[PDB]
Short mmCIF file of all heavy atoms in Angstrom, two decimals:
data_model
loop_
_atom_site.label_atom_id
_atom_site.label_comp_id
_atom_site.label_asym_id
_atom_site.label_seq_id
_atom_site.Cartn_x
_atom_site.Cartn_y
_atom_site.Cartn_z
N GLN D 12 51.98 -40.05 31.16
CA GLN D 12 52.29 -40.59 29.84
C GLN D 12 53.80 -40.78 29.76
O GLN D 12 54.53 -39.86 29.39
CB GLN D 12 51.78 -39.66 28.74
CG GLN D 12 52.21 -40.06 27.34
CD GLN D 12 51.77 -39.05 26.29
OE1 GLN D 12 51.21 -38.00 26.62
NE2 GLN D 12 52.04 -39.36 25.03
N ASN D 13 54.26 -41.98 30.10
CA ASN D 13 55.68 -42.29 30.07
C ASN D 13 56.05 -42.90 28.72
O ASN D 13 55.23 -43.54 28.06
CB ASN D 13 56.06 -43.25 31.19
CG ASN D 13 57.52 -43.16 31.57
OD1 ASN D 13 58.39 -42.99 30.70
ND2 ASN D 13 57.81 -43.27 32.86
N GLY D 14 57.30 -42.68 28.32
CA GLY D 14 57.76 -43.11 27.02
C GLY D 14 57.67 -42.00 25.99
O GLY D 14 57.38 -42.25 24.82
N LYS D 15 57.90 -40.77 26.43
CA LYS D 15 57.81 -39.62 25.55
C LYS D 15 59.01 -39.58 24.60
O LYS D 15 59.94 -40.38 24.70
CB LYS D 15 57.73 -38.33 26.35
CG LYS D 15 56.59 -38.29 27.36
CD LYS D 15 56.59 -36.98 28.14
CE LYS D 15 55.52 -36.98 29.23
NZ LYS D 15 54.15 -37.13 28.68
N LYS D 16 58.97 -38.62 23.68
CA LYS D 16 60.02 -38.46 22.68
C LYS D 16 61.12 -37.50 23.14
O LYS D 16 62.01 -37.17 22.35
CB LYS D 16 59.42 -37.99 21.36
CG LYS D 16 58.93 -36.54 21.34
CD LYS D 16 58.93 -35.98 19.93
CE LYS D 16 58.69 -34.48 19.91
NZ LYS D 16 57.24 -34.14 19.84
N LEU D 17 61.06 -37.04 24.38
CA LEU D 17 62.07 -36.17 24.99
C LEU D 17 62.21 -34.85 24.25
O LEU D 17 63.25 -34.19 24.39
CB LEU D 17 63.44 -36.85 25.06
CG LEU D 17 63.42 -38.32 25.51
CD1 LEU D 17 64.83 -38.90 25.55
CD2 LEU D 17 62.75 -38.46 26.87
N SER D 18 61.22 -34.44 23.47
CA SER D 18 61.27 -33.20 22.69
C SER D 18 62.39 -33.27 21.65
O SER D 18 63.15 -32.32 21.45
CB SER D 18 61.44 -31.98 23.61
OG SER D 18 60.46 -31.98 24.64
N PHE D 19 62.48 -34.42 21.00
CA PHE D 19 63.48 -34.65 19.97
C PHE D 19 62.83 -34.74 18.59
O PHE D 19 61.70 -35.22 18.44
CB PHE D 19 64.26 -35.93 20.24
CG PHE D 19 65.50 -35.73 21.08
CD1 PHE D 19 65.78 -36.59 22.13
CD2 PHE D 19 66.39 -34.70 20.81
CE1 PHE D 19 66.91 -36.41 22.90
CE2 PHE D 19 67.52 -34.52 21.58
CZ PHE D 19 67.78 -35.38 22.63
N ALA D 20 63.56 -34.26 17.59
CA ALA D 20 63.13 -34.31 16.20
C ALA D 20 64.20 -34.98 15.36
O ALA D 20 65.38 -35.00 15.71
CB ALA D 20 62.84 -32.90 15.67
N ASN D 21 63.77 -35.54 14.23
CA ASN D 21 64.66 -36.27 13.34
C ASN D 21 65.17 -35.35 12.23
O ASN D 21 64.92 -35.55 11.04
CB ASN D 21 63.95 -37.50 12.77
CG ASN D 21 62.63 -37.15 12.12
OD1 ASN D 21 62.29 -35.98 11.95
ND2 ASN D 21 61.86 -38.18 11.76
N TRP D 22 65.90 -34.32 12.65
CA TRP D 22 66.56 -33.42 11.72
C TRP D 22 67.63 -32.65 12.47
O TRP D 22 67.34 -32.04 13.51
CB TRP D 22 65.55 -32.46 11.06
CG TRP D 22 65.07 -31.37 11.96
CD1 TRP D 22 64.30 -31.51 13.07
CD2 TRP D 22 65.33 -29.97 11.82
NE1 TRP D 22 64.05 -30.27 13.63
CE2 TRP D 22 64.67 -29.31 12.88
CE3 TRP D 22 66.04 -29.20 10.89
CZ2 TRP D 22 64.72 -27.93 13.05
CZ3 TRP D 22 66.08 -27.83 11.06
CH2 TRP D 22 65.43 -27.21 12.13
N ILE D 23 68.86 -32.68 11.97
CA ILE D 23 70.00 -32.04 12.61
C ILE D 23 70.26 -30.70 11.96
O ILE D 23 70.22 -30.58 10.72
CB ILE D 23 71.25 -32.95 12.54
CG1 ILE D 23 71.00 -34.25 13.29
CG2 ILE D 23 72.46 -32.22 13.11
CD1 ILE D 23 71.94 -35.36 12.93
N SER D 24 70.52 -29.68 12.78
CA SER D 24 70.68 -28.31 12.32
C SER D 24 72.14 -27.90 12.51
O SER D 24 72.60 -27.70 13.64
CB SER D 24 69.74 -27.37 13.09
OG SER D 24 70.15 -26.02 12.96
N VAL D 25 72.86 -27.78 11.40
CA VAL D 25 74.23 -27.26 11.42
C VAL D 25 74.13 -25.74 11.38
O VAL D 25 73.79 -25.15 10.35
CB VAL D 25 75.06 -27.82 10.25
CG1 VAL D 25 75.13 -29.33 10.33
CG2 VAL D 25 74.49 -27.39 8.91
N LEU D 26 74.41 -25.10 12.52
CA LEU D 26 74.18 -23.66 12.63
C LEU D 26 75.01 -22.87 11.63
O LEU D 26 74.54 -21.85 11.12
CB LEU D 26 74.48 -23.19 14.06
CG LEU D 26 74.09 -21.75 14.39
CD1 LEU D 26 72.59 -21.55 14.30
CD2 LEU D 26 74.60 -21.37 15.77
N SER D 27 76.23 -23.32 11.34
CA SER D 27 77.07 -22.61 10.38
C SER D 27 76.97 -23.28 9.01
O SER D 27 77.00 -24.51 8.93
CB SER D 27 78.52 -22.60 10.84
OG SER D 27 79.29 -21.69 10.06
N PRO D 28 76.84 -22.51 7.92
CA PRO D 28 76.76 -23.13 6.59
C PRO D 28 78.11 -23.71 6.18
O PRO D 28 79.12 -23.00 6.17
CB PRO D 28 76.33 -21.97 5.69
CG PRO D 28 76.83 -20.76 6.38
CD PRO D 28 76.77 -21.04 7.85
N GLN D 29 78.12 -25.00 5.84
CA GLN D 29 79.35 -25.71 5.51
C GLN D 29 79.18 -26.52 4.22
O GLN D 29 79.85 -27.54 4.04
CB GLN D 29 79.77 -26.62 6.66
CG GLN D 29 80.01 -25.89 7.96
CD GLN D 29 80.30 -26.83 9.12
OE1 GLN D 29 81.27 -26.64 9.86
NE2 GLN D 29 79.46 -27.83 9.29
N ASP D 30 78.31 -26.07 3.33
CA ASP D 30 78.10 -26.74 2.05
C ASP D 30 78.97 -26.11 0.97
O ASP D 30 79.38 -24.96 1.06
CB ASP D 30 76.62 -26.67 1.65
CG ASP D 30 75.69 -27.06 2.78
OD1 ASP D 30 76.08 -27.91 3.61
OD2 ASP D 30 74.57 -26.51 2.85
N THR D 31 79.23 -26.90 -0.07
CA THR D 31 80.07 -26.47 -1.19
C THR D 31 79.40 -26.87 -2.49
O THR D 31 79.76 -27.87 -3.12
CB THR D 31 81.47 -27.09 -1.10
OG1 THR D 31 81.39 -28.50 -1.30
CG2 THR D 31 82.10 -26.80 0.26
N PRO D 32 78.40 -26.10 -2.93
CA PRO D 32 77.69 -26.46 -4.17
C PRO D 32 78.58 -26.52 -5.40
O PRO D 32 78.16 -27.09 -6.41
CB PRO D 32 76.63 -25.36 -4.30
CG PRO D 32 76.46 -24.81 -2.92
CD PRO D 32 77.80 -24.93 -2.27
N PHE D 33 79.79 -25.96 -5.35
CA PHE D 33 80.64 -25.92 -6.53
C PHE D 33 80.95 -27.32 -7.05
O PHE D 33 80.71 -27.64 -8.21
CB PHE D 33 81.92 -25.16 -6.22
CG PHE D 33 83.04 -25.45 -7.19
CD1 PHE D 33 83.04 -24.89 -8.45
CD2 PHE D 33 84.09 -26.27 -6.82
CE1 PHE D 33 84.06 -25.16 -9.34
CE2 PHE D 33 85.11 -26.54 -7.70
CZ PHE D 33 85.10 -25.99 -8.96
N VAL D 34 81.53 -28.16 -6.18
CA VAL D 34 81.91 -29.51 -6.61
C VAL D 34 80.67 -30.34 -6.92
O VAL D 34 80.64 -31.10 -7.90
CB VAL D 34 82.78 -30.18 -5.54
CG1 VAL D 34 83.08 -31.62 -5.93
CG2 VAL D 34 84.07 -29.39 -5.34
N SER D 35 79.63 -30.21 -6.09
CA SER D 35 78.39 -30.94 -6.34
C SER D 35 77.77 -30.58 -7.69
O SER D 35 77.09 -31.42 -8.29
CB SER D 35 77.39 -30.68 -5.22
OG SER D 35 77.96 -30.95 -3.95
N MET D 36 78.00 -29.36 -8.17
CA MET D 36 77.53 -28.97 -9.49
C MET D 36 78.45 -29.52 -10.58
O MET D 36 77.99 -30.14 -11.54
CB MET D 36 77.43 -27.45 -9.58
CG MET D 36 76.98 -26.91 -10.93
SD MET D 36 77.33 -25.15 -11.13
CE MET D 36 79.12 -25.16 -11.21
N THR D 37 79.75 -29.30 -10.43
CA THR D 37 80.72 -29.82 -11.40
C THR D 37 80.75 -31.34 -11.29
O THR D 37 81.30 -31.89 -10.33
CB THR D 37 82.10 -29.22 -11.14
OG1 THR D 37 82.44 -29.38 -9.76
CG2 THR D 37 82.11 -27.75 -11.51
N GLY D 38 80.18 -32.02 -12.28
CA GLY D 38 80.08 -33.47 -12.24
C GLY D 38 81.42 -34.12 -12.52
O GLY D 38 82.20 -33.64 -13.34
N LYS D 39 81.69 -35.23 -11.82
CA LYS D 39 82.91 -35.99 -12.01
C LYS D 39 82.71 -37.07 -13.06
O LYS D 39 81.60 -37.60 -13.24
CB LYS D 39 83.36 -36.62 -10.69
CG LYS D 39 82.38 -37.64 -10.12
CD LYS D 39 82.69 -37.95 -8.67
CE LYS D 39 81.66 -38.88 -8.06
NZ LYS D 39 81.64 -40.22 -8.71
N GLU D 40 83.79 -37.40 -13.76
CA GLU D 40 83.78 -38.40 -14.82
C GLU D 40 84.78 -39.50 -14.49
O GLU D 40 85.84 -39.24 -13.93
CB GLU D 40 84.10 -37.78 -16.18
CG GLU D 40 85.57 -37.44 -16.40
CD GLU D 40 86.08 -36.37 -15.45
OE1 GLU D 40 85.29 -35.93 -14.59
OE2 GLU D 40 87.26 -35.98 -15.57
N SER D 41 84.43 -40.73 -14.84
CA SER D 41 85.24 -41.89 -14.49
C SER D 41 86.29 -42.17 -15.56
O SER D 41 86.05 -41.97 -16.75
CB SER D 41 84.35 -43.12 -14.29
OG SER D 41 83.47 -42.93 -13.20
N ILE D 42 87.45 -42.64 -15.12
CA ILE D 42 88.51 -43.10 -16.01
C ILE D 42 89.05 -44.41 -15.45
O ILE D 42 89.47 -44.47 -14.29
CB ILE D 42 89.64 -42.06 -16.15
CG1 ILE D 42 90.56 -42.42 -17.32
CG2 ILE D 42 90.46 -41.96 -14.87
CD1 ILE D 42 89.99 -42.05 -18.68
N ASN D 43 89.01 -45.46 -16.27
CA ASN D 43 89.47 -46.78 -15.85
C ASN D 43 90.97 -46.94 -16.07
O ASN D 43 91.70 -47.34 -15.16
CB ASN D 43 88.70 -47.87 -16.60
CG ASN D 43 89.21 -49.26 -16.30
OD1 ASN D 43 89.59 -50.00 -17.21
ND2 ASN D 43 89.23 -49.62 -15.02
N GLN D 44 91.44 -46.62 -17.27
CA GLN D 44 92.85 -46.75 -17.59
C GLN D 44 93.64 -45.62 -16.93
O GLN D 44 93.11 -44.82 -16.16
CB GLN D 44 93.05 -46.75 -19.11
CG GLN D 44 92.16 -47.72 -19.87
CD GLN D 44 91.92 -47.30 -21.31
OE1 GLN D 44 92.30 -46.20 -21.72
NE2 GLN D 44 91.30 -48.18 -22.08
N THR D 45 94.94 -45.58 -17.23
CA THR D 45 95.84 -44.55 -16.71
C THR D 45 96.76 -44.02 -17.80
O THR D 45 97.89 -43.61 -17.53
CB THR D 45 96.65 -45.08 -15.53
OG1 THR D 45 97.39 -44.02 -14.93
CG2 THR D 45 97.60 -46.18 -15.98
N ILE D 46 96.29 -44.03 -19.05
CA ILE D 46 97.05 -43.53 -20.19
C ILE D 46 96.26 -42.41 -20.86
O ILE D 46 96.28 -42.27 -22.09
CB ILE D 46 97.38 -44.66 -21.19
CG1 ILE D 46 96.13 -45.47 -21.52
CG2 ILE D 46 98.47 -45.56 -20.63
CD1 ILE D 46 96.35 -46.51 -22.59
N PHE D 47 95.57 -41.62 -20.05
CA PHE D 47 94.68 -40.57 -20.55
C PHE D 47 95.39 -39.63 -21.51
O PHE D 47 96.62 -39.57 -21.55
CB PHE D 47 94.11 -39.77 -19.37
CG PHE D 47 95.16 -39.05 -18.56
CD1 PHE D 47 95.56 -37.77 -18.90
CD2 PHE D 47 95.76 -39.67 -17.48
CE1 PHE D 47 96.53 -37.11 -18.16
CE2 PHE D 47 96.73 -39.01 -16.74
CZ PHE D 47 97.11 -37.73 -17.08
N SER D 48 94.61 -38.88 -22.29
CA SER D 48 95.16 -37.90 -23.22
C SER D 48 94.03 -37.00 -23.70
O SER D 48 92.93 -37.48 -24.00
CB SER D 48 95.83 -38.58 -24.42
OG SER D 48 96.88 -39.44 -24.00
N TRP D 49 94.30 -35.69 -23.76
CA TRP D 49 93.33 -34.72 -24.24
C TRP D 49 93.99 -33.82 -25.28
O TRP D 49 95.22 -33.70 -25.34
CB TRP D 49 92.76 -33.87 -23.08
CG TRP D 49 93.67 -32.80 -22.56
CD1 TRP D 49 93.80 -31.53 -23.05
CD2 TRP D 49 94.56 -32.90 -21.45
NE1 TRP D 49 94.72 -30.83 -22.31
CE2 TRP D 49 95.21 -31.65 -21.32
CE3 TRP D 49 94.89 -33.92 -20.55
CZ2 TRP D 49 96.15 -31.40 -20.33
CZ3 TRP D 49 95.82 -33.67 -19.57
CH2 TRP D 49 96.45 -32.42 -19.47
N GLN D 50 93.15 -33.18 -26.09
CA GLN D 50 93.59 -32.38 -27.22
C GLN D 50 93.19 -30.93 -27.04
O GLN D 50 92.14 -30.63 -26.47
CB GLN D 50 93.00 -32.91 -28.53
CG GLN D 50 91.53 -33.27 -28.45
CD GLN D 50 91.02 -33.92 -29.72
OE1 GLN D 50 91.76 -34.10 -30.68
NE2 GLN D 50 89.74 -34.29 -29.72
N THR D 51 94.03 -30.03 -27.54
CA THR D 51 93.79 -28.60 -27.52
C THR D 51 93.85 -28.05 -28.94
O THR D 51 94.41 -28.67 -29.84
CB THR D 51 94.80 -27.86 -26.63
OG1 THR D 51 94.50 -26.47 -26.60
CG2 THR D 51 96.23 -28.08 -27.13
#
Side-chain angles (χ1 to χ4, degrees):
Chain D
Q12 173 184 4
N13 204 322
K15 305 179 185 299
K16 72 155 190 271
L17 317 180
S18 308
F19 270 134
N21 53 8
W22 75 293
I23 298 162
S24 163
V25 300
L26 189 64
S27 192
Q29 301 175 130
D30 312 328
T31 67
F33 160 76
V34 175
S35 306
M36 178 196 69
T37 51
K39 63 195 175 64
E40 76 295 3
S41 296
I42 193 78
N43 175 237
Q44 310 155 351
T45 187
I46 49 175
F47 62 89
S48 301
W49 77 86
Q50 44 186 359
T51 182

